[PDB]
Task: structure prediction
Amino acid sequence: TRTEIIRELERSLREQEELAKRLKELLRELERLQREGSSDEDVRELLREIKELVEEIEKLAREQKYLVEELKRQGNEIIRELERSLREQEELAKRLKELLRELERLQREGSSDEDVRELLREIKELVEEIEKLAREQKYLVEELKRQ
Result:
């Protein structure tokens, strides 16, 4: 082992926390490109790296779910709350990929500036939420490690 599973879960939550930090940096760059005018190729190359990062974030969520179940097999309230938190993060990442699809549709199919702003706003808030859940999950895994 259970110590091996906890160790790997800590590594994974640290990694997701860093991926979310990286994603907010790419979204800031994207705001800057759309804001100050950029080529279409510039915006695409960024949206491409953004969508890849989200897929990795989702993949780590699924990895973490599997490690928590492995721990369960081997603090019942803490585990129940980590399962709910990972399911929530999974869904949030699903919602983010959908907003990124819409964002590509606006940039490609032409859209007002207001439309793009509203979507970037909802996207940055969703990343903030995913980061918040990673920090919550790190706190719960430490509570479990003690227990």
Summary: Residues 99 and 122 are 8 Å apart (CA to CA). The helical segments are 3-36, 40-73, 76-109, 113-146. The two ends are 15 Å apart (CA to CA).
